[PDB]
Amino acid sequence: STLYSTQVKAVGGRSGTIRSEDGILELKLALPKELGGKGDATNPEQLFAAGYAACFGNAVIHVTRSNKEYKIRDNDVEVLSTVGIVANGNGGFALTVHLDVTLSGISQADAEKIVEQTHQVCPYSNAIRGNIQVSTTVYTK
Amino acid sequence: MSTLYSTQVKAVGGRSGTIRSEDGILELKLALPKELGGKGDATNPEQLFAAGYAACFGNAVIHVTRSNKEYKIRDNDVEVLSTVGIVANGNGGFALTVHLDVTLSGISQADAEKIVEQTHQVCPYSNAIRGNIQVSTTVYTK
Ligand SMILES: O=c1[nH]sc2cc(F)ccc12
Ligand SMILES: O=c1[nH]sc2cc(F)ccc12
């Protein structure tokens, strides 16, 4: 059963607007300068990069807890997502995704094992498996 | 193919933390919604995914309409309302669900349905999640 559901209205594509129905997310969008736009507002790739970095970091927190070896706080987890858009060779586009994951205060080996476990848990990682090959680098700070 | 555009976003502290693009343009705080034991202060990964996919899909609808060469449209004649949910799967795990309501102004119902079916082949979010999330879509004209 559905634990949480949300609606967002988008009008006018990549030059237009988004507004969540509850008003909490309300943003103008622009084409980036690389595509000839002004780049003075966000875009689908940035919104996706943000959703996935946040969800993945959250799931890393949950996996590190319950493994029950380390006593970590929220901000000991940073995820830097790189999301790109490319033509797919079949008249459409694909995303590319890279994640740099930085965990504070745990060993390199444990951090890598935690990130591997998290990739099986995170809803977004499971949403793209078999279509996008996500690449990941793990850092320990 | 070479990448047409790439962007970076740093997220700290999971669903109760923050996001910020490396160019400063997108910078937001996040909160668990009340349904998941939070305040709802602020946006969240499902709302951000919903927004990106509704906007990308609307843009592809525009592109497909224009490449089919029949209709005169402006950008704001396309609207996408996405519903994104998070459900329990498997063994205490979680999955995403997506429904799209697509509304095209000024075109016929059968043409709008053909356009929306073609845009699912173009939009990179649809291509990204195919076979993992079973997207449902309803098409309206007005
Ligand atoms: O991102 C997540 N991974 S574990 C989890 C549990 C929730 F209840 C909501 C989100 C997440
Ligand atoms: O969503 C899209 N469908 S057509 C297109 C062309 C672009 F250059 C960037 C995004 C899109």
Coordinates of all heavy atoms in Angstrom, one line a residue, chain A residues 3-10 12-14 18 21-22 24-25 29 32 34 39 41-44 46 48 50 53-55 58 74 77-88 93 124 126-129 131, chain B residues 1-2 4-15 19 23 25 30 33 40 42-48 50-51 54-56 59 75 78-86 94 122 124-125 127-130 132:
Chain A
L3 N 2.4 4.6 1.0 CA 2.7 5.2 2.2 C 2.6 6.8 2.1 O 2.3 7.4 3.1 CB 4.1 4.8 2.7 CG 4.2 3.3 3.1 CD1 5.6 2.8 2.7 CD2 4.0 3.2 4.6
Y4 N 3.0 7.3 1.0 CA 3.0 8.7 0.7 C 2.8 9.0 -0.7 O 3.5 8.3 -1.6 CB 4.3 9.4 1.2 CG 4.4 10.8 0.8 CD1 3.6 11.8 1.4 CD2 5.4 11.2 -0.1 CE1 3.8 13.2 1.0 CE2 5.6 12.5 -0.5 CZ 4.8 13.5 0.0 OH 5.0 14.8 -0.4
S5 N 2.0 9.9 -1.1 CA 1.8 10.2 -2.5 C 1.8 11.7 -2.7 O 1.4 12.5 -1.8 CB 0.5 9.6 -3.0 OG 0.3 9.8 -4.3
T6 N 2.4 12.2 -3.8 CA 2.5 13.6 -4.0 C 2.2 13.9 -5.5 O 2.5 13.1 -6.4 CB 3.8 14.2 -3.6 OG1 3.8 15.7 -3.7 CG2 5.0 13.7 -4.4
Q7 N 1.6 15.1 -5.8 CA 1.3 15.6 -7.1 C 2.1 16.9 -7.4 O 2.1 17.8 -6.6 CB -0.2 15.7 -7.3 CG -1.0 14.5 -7.1 CD -2.4 14.7 -7.5 OE1 -3.0 15.8 -7.2 NE2 -3.0 13.8 -8.3
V8 N 2.6 17.0 -8.6 CA 3.3 18.2 -9.1 C 2.7 18.5 -10.5 O 2.6 17.6 -11.3 CB 4.8 18.0 -9.2 CG1 5.4 19.3 -9.6 CG2 5.4 17.6 -7.8
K9 N 2.3 19.7 -10.7 CA 1.8 20.2 -12.0 C 3.0 20.9 -12.8 O 3.5 21.9 -12.2 CB 0.6 21.1 -11.9 CG 0.1 21.6 -13.2 CD -1.0 22.7 -13.1 CE -2.0 22.4 -12.1 NZ -3.1 23.4 -12.0
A10 N 3.2 20.5 -14.0 CA 4.2 21.2 -14.8 C 3.6 21.7 -16.1 O 2.9 21.0 -16.8 CB 5.4 20.2 -15.2
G12 N 4.2 23.9 -19.7 CA 5.1 24.5 -20.6 C 6.5 23.9 -20.8 O 7.4 24.6 -21.4
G13 N 6.8 22.7 -20.3 CA 8.1 22.1 -20.6 C 9.3 22.7 -19.9 O 9.1 23.4 -18.9
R14 N 10.4 22.7 -20.6 CA 11.7 23.1 -19.9 C 11.9 24.6 -19.8 O 12.8 25.0 -19.1 CB 12.9 22.4 -20.7 CG 13.0 20.9 -20.3 CD 14.0 20.3 -21.3 NE 14.1 18.9 -21.1 CZ 15.0 18.3 -20.3 NH1 15.9 19.1 -19.6 NH2 15.0 17.0 -20.1
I18 N 6.9 24.6 -12.5 CA 6.4 23.4 -11.8 C 5.8 24.0 -10.5 O 6.2 25.0 -9.9 CB 7.5 22.4 -11.3 CG1 8.5 23.1 -10.4 CG2 8.1 21.8 -12.6 CD1 9.4 22.2 -9.6
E21 N 1.1 20.4 -5.7 CA -0.3 20.7 -5.4 C -0.4 21.4 -4.0 O -1.2 22.3 -3.8 CB -1.2 19.5 -5.5 CG -1.5 19.0 -6.9 CD -2.2 20.0 -7.8 OE1 -2.1 21.3 -7.6 OE2 -2.7 19.6 -8.8
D22 N 0.4 20.9 -3.1 CA 0.4 21.5 -1.7 C 1.3 22.8 -1.6 O 1.4 23.4 -0.5 CB 0.9 20.5 -0.7 CG 2.4 20.1 -0.9 OD1 3.1 20.6 -1.8 OD2 2.9 19.2 -0.1
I24 N 4.3 23.6 -1.7 CA 5.7 23.6 -1.1 C 6.8 23.7 -2.1 O 7.8 24.4 -1.8 CB 5.8 22.3 -0.2 CG1 4.9 22.5 1.1 CG2 7.3 22.1 0.2 CD1 4.4 21.2 1.6
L25 N 6.6 23.1 -3.3 CA 7.7 23.2 -4.3 C 7.1 24.0 -5.4 O 6.1 23.6 -6.1 CB 8.1 21.8 -4.7 CG 9.2 21.7 -5.8 CD1 10.5 22.3 -5.2 CD2 9.4 20.3 -6.3
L29 N 11.5 27.2 -14.5 CA 12.5 26.4 -15.1 C 13.1 27.1 -16.3 O 12.4 27.9 -17.0 CB 11.9 25.0 -15.6 CG 12.0 23.8 -14.7 CD1 11.5 24.1 -13.3 CD2 11.2 22.7 -15.4
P32 N 19.4 25.3 -19.9 CA 20.7 25.7 -19.4 C 21.5 26.5 -20.6 O 21.1 26.4 -21.7 CB 21.5 24.4 -19.1 CG 20.7 23.3 -19.7 CD 19.3 23.8 -19.9
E34 N 24.4 25.8 -21.8 CA 24.9 24.8 -22.8 C 23.9 24.5 -23.9 O 24.3 24.3 -25.1 CB 25.3 23.5 -22.1 CG 26.5 23.7 -21.1 CD 26.0 23.9 -19.7 OE1 25.1 24.8 -19.4 OE2 26.6 23.2 -18.8
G39 N 19.8 29.9 -18.4 CA 20.3 29.2 -17.2 C 20.1 29.9 -15.9 O 20.9 29.8 -15.0
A41 N 17.4 29.4 -14.0 CA 16.5 28.6 -13.2 C 16.8 27.2 -13.4 O 17.6 26.8 -14.2 CB 15.0 28.9 -13.6
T42 N 16.2 26.3 -12.5 CA 16.6 24.9 -12.5 C 16.0 24.2 -13.7 O 15.4 24.8 -14.6 CB 16.1 24.3 -11.2 OG1 16.7 22.9 -11.1 CG2 14.6 24.1 -11.1
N43 N 16.1 22.8 -13.7 CA 15.8 22.0 -14.9 C 15.6 20.6 -14.5 O 16.0 20.2 -13.3 CB 16.9 22.2 -16.0 CG 18.3 21.7 -15.4 OD1 18.5 20.6 -15.0 ND2 19.3 22.7 -15.5
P44 N 15.0 19.8 -15.3 CA 14.7 18.4 -14.9 C 15.9 17.6 -14.4 O 15.7 16.8 -13.5 CB 14.1 17.8 -16.2 CG 13.3 19.0 -16.8 CD 14.2 20.2 -16.5
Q46 N 18.6 18.6 -12.9 CA 18.9 19.1 -11.6 C 17.9 18.6 -10.5 O 18.3 18.2 -9.4 CB 19.0 20.6 -11.5 CG 20.3 21.1 -12.0 CD 20.5 22.6 -11.7 OE1 19.6 23.3 -11.2 NE2 21.8 23.1 -11.9
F48 N 16.1 15.9 -10.7 CA 16.4 14.4 -10.6 C 17.6 14.2 -9.8 O 17.6 13.3 -8.9 CB 16.4 13.8 -12.0 CG 16.6 12.3 -11.9 CD1 15.5 11.5 -11.6 CD2 17.8 11.7 -12.0 CE1 15.6 10.1 -11.6 CE2 18.0 10.3 -12.0 CZ 16.9 9.5 -11.7
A50 N 18.9 16.0 -7.6 CA 18.6 16.3 -6.2 C 17.8 15.2 -5.5 O 18.1 14.8 -4.4 CB 17.9 17.6 -6.1
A53 N 20.1 12.1 -5.1 CA 21.2 12.2 -4.1 C 20.6 12.2 -2.7 O 21.1 11.5 -1.8 CB 21.9 13.5 -4.3
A54 N 19.4 12.9 -2.5 CA 18.8 12.9 -1.2 C 18.3 11.6 -0.8 O 18.5 11.1 0.4 CB 17.7 14.0 -1.2
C55 N 17.5 10.9 -1.7 CA 17.0 9.6 -1.3 C 18.1 8.6 -1.0 O 18.1 7.8 -0.1 CB 16.1 9.0 -2.4 SG 15.5 7.3 -2.1
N58 N 19.8 9.3 2.3 CA 18.9 8.8 3.4 C 19.0 7.3 3.6 O 19.0 6.8 4.7 CB 17.5 9.2 3.1 CG 16.6 9.2 4.3 OD1 16.6 10.1 5.1 ND2 16.0 8.0 4.6
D74 N 23.2 12.3 10.8 CA 22.7 12.6 9.5 C 23.7 13.2 8.6 O 24.0 12.7 7.5 CB 21.4 13.5 9.5 CG 20.2 12.8 10.0 OD1 20.3 11.5 10.3 OD2 19.1 13.4 10.1
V77 N 26.8 12.0 6.1 CA 26.6 11.4 4.8 C 26.3 12.5 3.8 O 25.4 13.3 3.9 CB 25.3 10.5 4.8 CG1 25.2 9.8 3.4 CG2 25.5 9.4 5.8
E78 N 27.2 12.6 2.8 CA 27.0 13.5 1.6 C 26.9 12.7 0.4 O 27.7 11.7 0.2 CB 28.2 14.5 1.5 CG 28.1 15.3 0.3 CD 29.4 16.1 0.0 OE1 29.9 16.7 1.0 OE2 29.9 16.0 -1.2
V79 N 26.0 13.0 -0.5 CA 25.9 12.4 -1.9 C 26.0 13.5 -2.9 O 25.2 14.5 -2.8 CB 24.7 11.6 -2.0 CG1 24.6 11.0 -3.5 CG2 24.6 10.5 -1.0
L80 N 27.0 13.4 -3.8 CA 27.1 14.3 -4.9 C 26.7 13.6 -6.1 O 27.4 12.6 -6.5 CB 28.5 14.9 -5.1 CG 28.7 15.9 -6.2 CD1 27.9 17.2 -5.9 CD2 30.1 16.2 -6.5
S81 N 25.5 13.9 -6.7 CA 25.1 13.3 -7.9 C 25.5 14.1 -9.1 O 25.4 15.4 -9.1 CB 23.6 13.0 -7.9 OG 22.9 14.2 -7.6
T82 N 26.0 13.5 -10.2 CA 26.2 14.0 -11.5 C 25.2 13.4 -12.5 O 25.2 12.2 -12.6 CB 27.6 13.8 -12.0 OG1 28.5 14.3 -11.0 CG2 27.8 14.5 -13.3
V83 N 24.3 14.2 -13.0 CA 23.3 13.7 -13.9 C 23.4 14.4 -15.3 O 23.5 15.6 -15.3 CB 21.8 13.9 -13.4 CG1 20.8 13.5 -14.5 CG2 21.6 13.0 -12.2
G84 N 23.5 13.6 -16.3 CA 23.6 14.1 -17.7 C 22.5 13.6 -18.6 O 21.9 12.6 -18.3
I85 N 22.3 14.3 -19.7 CA 21.3 13.9 -20.7 C 22.0 13.8 -22.0 O 22.8 14.6 -22.4 CB 20.1 14.9 -20.8 CG1 19.1 14.4 -21.8 CG2 20.6 16.3 -21.0 CD1 17.8 15.1 -21.8
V86 N 21.7 12.7 -22.7 CA 22.4 12.3 -24.0 C 21.3 11.7 -24.9 O 20.4 11.1 -24.5 CB 23.5 11.3 -23.7 CG1 23.0 10.0 -23.0 CG2 24.2 10.9 -25.0
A87 N 21.5 11.9 -26.2 CA 20.7 11.2 -27.2 C 21.0 9.7 -27.1 O 22.1 9.2 -27.0 CB 20.9 11.7 -28.6
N88 N 19.9 8.9 -27.3 CA 20.1 7.4 -27.0 C 20.3 6.6 -28.3 O 20.3 5.4 -28.2 CB 18.8 6.8 -26.3 CG 17.5 7.0 -27.0 OD1 17.4 7.4 -28.2 ND2 16.4 6.6 -26.3
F93 N 16.1 10.4 -25.7 CA 17.2 10.8 -24.8 C 17.2 9.8 -23.6 O 16.2 9.1 -23.3 CB 17.0 12.2 -24.4 CG 17.0 13.2 -25.5 CD1 15.9 13.5 -26.2 CD2 18.2 13.7 -26.0 CE1 15.8 14.4 -27.3 CE2 18.2 14.6 -27.1 CZ 17.0 14.9 -27.7
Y124 N 15.2 4.8 -6.0 CA 15.6 5.4 -7.2 C 16.6 4.5 -8.0 O 16.4 4.2 -9.2 CB 16.1 6.8 -7.0 CG 15.1 7.7 -6.5 CD1 14.4 7.5 -5.3 CD2 14.8 8.9 -7.2 CE1 13.5 8.4 -4.8 CE2 13.8 9.8 -6.7 CZ 13.2 9.5 -5.5 OH 12.2 10.3 -5.0
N126 N 16.6 1.3 -7.7 CA 15.8 0.2 -8.3 C 15.0 0.7 -9.4 O 14.7 -0.1 -10.4 CB 15.0 -0.5 -7.2 CG 15.8 -1.2 -6.1 OD1 16.8 -1.8 -6.4 ND2 15.3 -1.2 -4.9
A127 N 14.6 2.0 -9.4 CA 13.8 2.5 -10.5 C 14.5 2.5 -11.9 O 13.9 2.4 -12.9 CB 13.3 3.9 -10.2
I128 N 15.8 2.6 -11.9 CA 16.6 2.8 -13.1 C 17.4 1.5 -13.5 O 18.0 1.6 -14.6 CB 17.4 4.0 -13.1 CG1 18.6 3.9 -12.1 CG2 16.6 5.3 -12.8 CD1 19.3 5.3 -11.9
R129 N 17.4 0.5 -12.7 CA 18.3 -0.6 -13.0 C 17.9 -1.3 -14.3 O 16.8 -1.5 -14.6 CB 18.3 -1.6 -11.8 CG 19.4 -2.7 -11.9 CD 19.4 -3.6 -10.6 NE 20.0 -2.8 -9.5 CZ 19.2 -2.4 -8.5 NH1 18.0 -2.7 -8.4 NH2 19.8 -1.7 -7.5
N131 N 18.3 0.0 -17.2 CA 18.2 1.1 -18.2 C 19.4 2.0 -18.2 O 19.9 2.4 -19.2 CB 16.9 1.8 -18.1 CG 15.7 1.0 -18.3 OD1 15.6 0.3 -19.3 ND2 14.7 1.0 -17.3
Chain B
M1 N 27.4 8.6 -28.1 CA 27.0 10.0 -28.2 C 27.6 10.8 -27.1 O 27.8 10.3 -26.0 CB 25.5 10.2 -28.2 CG 24.7 9.2 -29.0 SD 24.9 9.6 -30.8 CE 23.8 8.3 -31.5
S2 N 28.0 12.1 -27.4 CA 28.5 12.9 -26.3 C 27.3 13.5 -25.5 O 26.2 13.8 -26.0 CB 29.3 14.1 -26.9 OG 30.5 13.6 -27.5
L4 N 25.0 16.1 -23.8 CA 24.6 17.4 -24.2 C 24.6 18.4 -23.0 O 24.8 19.6 -23.2 CB 23.2 17.3 -24.8 CG 23.1 16.5 -26.0 CD1 21.7 16.4 -26.5 CD2 24.0 17.1 -27.1
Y5 N 24.3 17.9 -21.8 CA 24.3 18.8 -20.6 C 24.5 17.9 -19.4 O 23.9 16.8 -19.3 CB 23.1 19.6 -20.5 CG 22.8 20.3 -19.2 CD1 23.6 21.4 -18.8 CD2 21.9 19.8 -18.3 CE1 23.4 22.0 -17.6 CE2 21.7 20.4 -17.1 CZ 22.4 21.5 -16.8 OH 22.2 22.2 -15.6
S6 N 25.2 18.4 -18.4 CA 25.5 17.7 -17.2 C 25.4 18.6 -16.0 O 25.7 19.8 -16.2 CB 26.9 17.1 -17.2 OG 27.2 16.3 -16.1
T7 N 24.9 18.2 -14.9 CA 24.8 19.0 -13.7 C 25.1 18.2 -12.5 O 25.0 17.0 -12.4 CB 23.4 19.7 -13.6 OG1 23.4 20.7 -12.6 CG2 22.4 18.6 -13.4
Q8 N 25.5 18.9 -11.4 CA 25.9 18.3 -10.2 C 25.0 18.8 -9.0 O 24.8 20.0 -9.0 CB 27.3 18.5 -9.8 CG 28.3 17.7 -10.7 CD 29.6 17.5 -10.1 OE1 30.1 18.4 -9.4 NE2 30.3 16.4 -10.4
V9 N 24.6 18.0 -8.1 CA 23.8 18.4 -7.0 C 24.3 17.6 -5.7 O 24.4 16.4 -5.8 CB 22.3 18.1 -7.1 CG1 21.5 18.6 -5.9 CG2 21.7 18.9 -8.4
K10 N 24.6 18.4 -4.7 CA 25.1 17.8 -3.4 C 23.9 17.8 -2.4 O 23.3 18.8 -2.2 CB 26.2 18.7 -2.9 CG 26.9 18.2 -1.6 CD 28.0 19.1 -1.1 CE 29.0 19.5 -2.1 NZ 30.1 20.3 -1.4
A11 N 23.7 16.6 -1.9 CA 22.7 16.4 -0.9 C 23.3 15.9 0.4 O 24.1 14.9 0.4 CB 21.6 15.4 -1.3
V12 N 23.0 16.6 1.5 CA 23.6 16.3 2.8 C 22.5 15.9 3.8 O 21.6 16.7 4.0 CB 24.5 17.5 3.4 CG1 25.0 17.1 4.7 CG2 25.6 17.8 2.4
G13 N 22.6 14.8 4.5 CA 21.8 14.5 5.6 C 20.4 13.8 5.3 O 19.5 13.9 6.1
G14 N 20.3 13.2 4.1 CA 19.2 12.4 3.7 C 17.9 13.3 3.6 O 17.9 14.4 3.3
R15 N 16.8 12.6 4.0 CA 15.5 13.2 3.8 C 15.1 14.3 4.8 O 14.1 15.0 4.6 CB 14.4 12.1 3.9 CG 14.3 11.3 2.6 CD 13.4 10.1 2.8 NE 13.4 9.3 1.6 CZ 12.5 9.3 0.7 NH1 11.4 10.1 0.8 NH2 12.6 8.5 -0.4
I19 N 19.7 20.1 -0.2 CA 20.2 19.9 -1.5 C 20.7 21.2 -2.0 O 20.1 22.2 -1.7 CB 19.2 19.3 -2.5 CG1 18.1 20.2 -2.7 CG2 18.8 17.9 -2.1 CD1 17.2 20.0 -3.8
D23 N 26.1 24.9 -9.1 CA 26.0 26.2 -9.7 C 25.1 27.2 -8.9 O 24.9 28.3 -9.3 CB 25.4 26.1 -11.2 CG 23.9 25.6 -11.2 OD1 23.3 25.4 -10.2 OD2 23.4 25.4 -12.3
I25 N 22.0 27.4 -8.5 CA 20.7 27.7 -8.9 C 19.6 27.0 -8.1 O 18.6 27.6 -7.7 CB 20.6 27.4 -10.5 CG1 21.4 28.4 -11.3 CG2 19.1 27.5 -10.9 CD1 21.9 27.9 -12.6
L30 N 14.9 20.0 2.8 CA 14.0 18.8 2.7 C 13.4 18.5 4.1 O 14.1 18.7 5.1 CB 14.7 17.6 2.1 CG 15.5 17.8 0.8 CD1 16.1 16.5 0.3 CD2 14.6 18.4 -0.3
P33 N 7.6 14.3 4.9 CA 6.2 14.7 5.1 C 5.5 14.1 6.3 O 6.1 13.1 6.9 CB 5.5 14.2 3.8 CG 6.4 13.0 3.4 CD 7.8 13.3 3.8
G40 N 6.5 18.2 7.1 CA 6.1 18.7 5.8 C 6.4 20.1 5.5 O 5.8 20.7 4.6
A42 N 8.7 21.3 3.8 CA 9.7 21.4 2.8 C 9.5 20.2 1.9 O 8.8 19.2 2.2 CB 11.1 21.5 3.4
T43 N 10.2 20.3 0.8 CA 10.0 19.3 -0.3 C 10.8 18.0 0.1 O 11.3 17.9 1.2 CB 10.4 19.9 -1.6 OG1 10.0 19.0 -2.6 CG2 12.0 20.1 -1.7
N44 N 10.8 17.1 -0.8 CA 11.2 15.7 -0.5 C 11.5 15.0 -1.9 O 11.1 15.6 -2.9 CB 10.1 15.0 0.3 CG 8.8 14.9 -0.5 OD1 8.7 14.4 -1.6 ND2 7.7 15.4 0.2
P45 N 12.2 13.9 -1.8 CA 12.7 13.3 -3.1 C 11.5 12.9 -4.1 O 11.8 12.9 -5.3 CB 13.4 12.0 -2.6 CG 14.0 12.5 -1.3 CD 12.8 13.2 -0.7
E46 N 10.4 12.5 -3.6 CA 9.3 12.2 -4.5 C 8.7 13.4 -5.2 O 8.4 13.3 -6.4 CB 8.2 11.4 -3.7 CG 8.6 10.0 -3.3 CD 9.7 10.0 -2.2 OE1 9.5 10.7 -1.2 OE2 10.7 9.3 -2.5
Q47 N 8.6 14.5 -4.4 CA 8.1 15.7 -5.0 C 9.1 16.3 -6.1 O 8.7 16.8 -7.1 CB 7.9 16.7 -3.9 CG 7.0 17.8 -4.0 CD 6.7 18.5 -2.7 OE1 7.5 19.4 -2.3 NE2 5.6 18.2 -2.1
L48 N 10.4 16.1 -5.8 CA 11.4 16.6 -6.7 C 11.5 15.7 -8.0 O 11.5 16.2 -9.1 CB 12.8 16.6 -6.1 CG 13.1 17.7 -5.1 CD1 14.4 17.3 -4.3 CD2 13.3 19.1 -5.8
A50 N 8.8 14.0 -9.1 CA 7.6 14.2 -9.8 C 7.7 15.5 -10.6 O 7.3 15.5 -11.8 CB 6.4 14.4 -8.7
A51 N 8.3 16.5 -10.1 CA 8.5 17.8 -10.8 C 9.4 17.6 -12.0 O 9.0 18.1 -13.1 CB 9.1 18.9 -9.8
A54 N 7.4 15.5 -14.6 CA 6.3 16.2 -15.3 C 6.8 17.2 -16.3 O 6.3 17.4 -17.4 CB 5.4 16.8 -14.2
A55 N 7.9 17.9 -15.9 CA 8.4 19.0 -16.8 C 9.1 18.5 -18.0 O 8.9 19.0 -19.1 CB 9.4 19.9 -16.0
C56 N 9.9 17.4 -17.8 CA 10.6 16.8 -19.0 C 9.6 16.2 -19.9 O 9.7 16.3 -21.1 CB 11.6 15.7 -18.5 SG 12.4 14.9 -19.9
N59 N 7.8 18.8 -21.9 CA 8.7 19.3 -22.9 C 8.8 18.4 -24.1 O 8.7 18.8 -25.3 CB 10.1 19.6 -22.4 CG 10.9 20.4 -23.2 OD1 10.8 21.7 -23.2 ND2 11.6 19.8 -24.2
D75 N 4.0 26.7 -26.0 CA 4.5 25.9 -24.9 C 3.4 25.6 -23.8 O 3.2 24.5 -23.3 CB 5.7 26.6 -24.2 CG 6.9 26.5 -25.1 OD1 6.9 25.9 -26.2 OD2 8.0 27.1 -24.7
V78 N 0.6 22.6 -23.1 CA 0.8 21.3 -22.6 C 1.0 21.4 -21.1 O 1.7 22.2 -20.6 CB 2.1 20.7 -23.2 CG1 2.4 19.4 -22.6 CG2 1.9 20.5 -24.7
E79 N 0.2 20.5 -20.4 CA 0.3 20.4 -19.0 C 0.5 19.0 -18.6 O -0.2 18.1 -19.1 CB -1.0 21.0 -18.3 CG -1.1 20.9 -16.9 CD -2.5 21.2 -16.4 OE1 -3.0 22.3 -16.6 OE2 -3.1 20.3 -15.7
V80 N 1.3 18.7 -17.6 CA 1.5 17.4 -17.0 C 1.4 17.4 -15.5 O 2.1 18.2 -14.9 CB 2.9 16.8 -17.4 CG1 3.1 15.4 -16.8 CG2 3.1 16.8 -19.0
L81 N 0.5 16.6 -15.0 CA 0.3 16.5 -13.6 C 0.8 15.1 -13.2 O 0.1 14.1 -13.6 CB -1.2 16.6 -13.2 CG -1.5 16.5 -11.7 CD1 -0.7 17.5 -10.9 CD2 -3.0 16.8 -11.5
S82 N 1.9 15.0 -12.5 CA 2.4 13.7 -12.1 C 2.1 13.4 -10.7 O 2.1 14.3 -9.8 CB 4.0 13.7 -12.3 OG 4.5 14.7 -11.5
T83 N 1.7 12.1 -10.4 CA 1.5 11.6 -9.1 C 2.6 10.6 -8.8 O 2.7 9.6 -9.5 CB 0.1 11.0 -9.0 OG1 -0.9 11.9 -9.3 CG2 -0.1 10.5 -7.5
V84 N 3.4 10.8 -7.8 CA 4.5 9.9 -7.4 C 4.2 9.4 -6.0 O 3.9 10.3 -5.1 CB 5.8 10.6 -7.5 CG1 6.9 9.7 -6.9 CG2 6.1 10.9 -9.0
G85 N 4.2 8.1 -5.8 CA 4.1 7.6 -4.5 C 5.2 6.6 -4.1 O 6.0 6.2 -5.0
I86 N 5.3 6.3 -2.9 CA 6.3 5.4 -2.4 C 5.5 4.3 -1.6 O 4.7 4.5 -0.8 CB 7.4 6.0 -1.5 CG1 8.4 5.1 -1.0 CG2 6.7 6.9 -0.4 CD1 9.8 5.7 -0.7
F94 N 11.1 -0.5 -0.3 CA 10.3 0.5 -0.9 C 10.5 0.7 -2.4 O 11.6 0.6 -2.9 CB 10.5 1.8 -0.1 CG 10.3 1.8 1.3 CD1 11.4 1.5 2.2 CD2 9.0 1.8 1.9 CE1 11.1 1.4 3.6 CE2 8.8 1.7 3.2 CZ 9.9 1.5 4.1
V122 N 10.6 9.2 -26.2 CA 11.5 10.3 -26.3 C 12.0 10.7 -24.9 O 13.3 10.9 -24.7 CB 10.8 11.5 -27.0 CG1 11.8 12.8 -27.0 CG2 10.4 11.2 -28.4
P124 N 13.6 11.1 -21.4 CA 14.6 10.2 -20.8 C 14.2 9.7 -19.4 O 14.7 8.7 -19.0 CB 15.8 11.2 -20.7 CG 15.3 12.6 -20.8 CD 14.0 12.5 -21.5
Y125 N 13.3 10.3 -18.7 CA 12.8 9.7 -17.5 C 11.9 8.4 -17.8 O 12.1 7.4 -17.1 CB 11.9 10.6 -16.7 CG 12.5 11.8 -16.0 CD1 13.3 12.7 -16.7 CD2 12.3 11.9 -14.6 CE1 13.8 13.8 -16.0 CE2 12.8 12.9 -13.9 CZ 13.6 13.9 -14.6 OH 14.1 14.9 -13.8
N127 N 12.3 6.5 -20.4 CA 13.3 5.5 -20.8 C 14.1 5.0 -19.6 O 14.5 3.9 -19.6 CB 14.3 6.1 -21.8 CG 13.6 6.3 -23.2 OD1 12.7 5.5 -23.6 ND2 14.0 7.4 -23.8
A128 N 14.2 5.9 -18.6 CA 15.1 5.5 -17.4 C 14.4 4.5 -16.6 O 15.0 3.6 -16.0 CB 15.3 6.8 -16.5
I129 N 13.0 4.6 -16.4 CA 12.3 3.7 -15.5 C 11.6 2.6 -16.1 O 10.8 1.9 -15.4 CB 11.4 4.6 -14.6 CG1 10.3 5.2 -15.4 CG2 12.2 5.7 -14.0 CD1 9.5 6.2 -14.7
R130 N 11.7 2.4 -17.4 CA 10.9 1.4 -18.1 C 11.1 0.0 -17.6 O 12.3 -0.4 -17.4 CB 11.1 1.4 -19.6 CG 10.1 0.5 -20.4 CD 10.2 0.7 -21.9 NE 9.8 2.0 -22.3 CZ 10.6 3.0 -22.6 NH1 11.9 2.9 -22.6 NH2 10.0 4.2 -22.9
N132 N 10.8 -1.1 -14.6 CA 10.9 -1.1 -13.1 C 9.7 -0.5 -12.5 O 9.1 -1.0 -11.6 CB 12.2 -0.4 -12.7 CG 13.4 -1.1 -13.3 OD1 13.6 -2.3 -13.2 ND2 14.2 -0.2 -14.0

